[PDB]
């Protein structure tokens, strides 16, 4: 398999594609055209629910940019902060945090199913820059 959240806004990022440029001899170019058949007119903000296959033929789903703020794919910034509750350079509200695609608003474990809308107080404001 392969799992990685790339935040570039492009579909040729160096860390992932390098080892994935022509990997999987069975689907070197087959995988390329498989995930570039459609959605091309779309913006490849994250492009990674890809589970695993021997043929690389599946459906995509852009889950979300960083839960801190989902404006990475909207405005186009590619930065954040590090300190806890540092500041907020990015404005955001419920304008787009209502649906945020069909993601897994659950927990990694078989724990519980409360997530997604937790951007206000949950696991989004770790660095501070979030809803203002």
């Amino acid at each position: 398999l392969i799992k990685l959240q790339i935040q570039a806004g492009q579909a040729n990022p160096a860390p992932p594609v390098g080892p994935a440029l022509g990997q999987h001899g069975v689907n070197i170019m087959e995988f390329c055209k498989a995930y570039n058949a459609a959605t091309e007119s779309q913006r490849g903000n994250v492009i990674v629910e890809i589970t695993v296959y021997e043929d690389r033929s599946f459906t995509f789903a852009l889950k979300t940019p960083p839960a801190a703020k989902l404006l990475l794919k909207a405005a186009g910034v590619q930065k954040g902060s590090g300190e806890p509750h540092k500041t907020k350079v990015a404005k955001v509200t419920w304008d787009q945090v209502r649906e945020i695609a069909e993601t897994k608003k659950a927990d990694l474990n078989a724990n519980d199913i409360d997530a997604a809308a937790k951007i206000i107080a949950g696991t989004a404001r770790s660095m501070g820059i979030t809803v203002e």
């Binding site: 390098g18 080892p19 440029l21 022509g22 990997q23 001899g25 070197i28």
Partner: peptide
């Protein structure tokens, strides 16, 4: 290096 092996980098 081909860049498909991962080991070569």
């Amino acid at each position: 290096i081909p860049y498909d092996r991962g080991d070569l980098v």
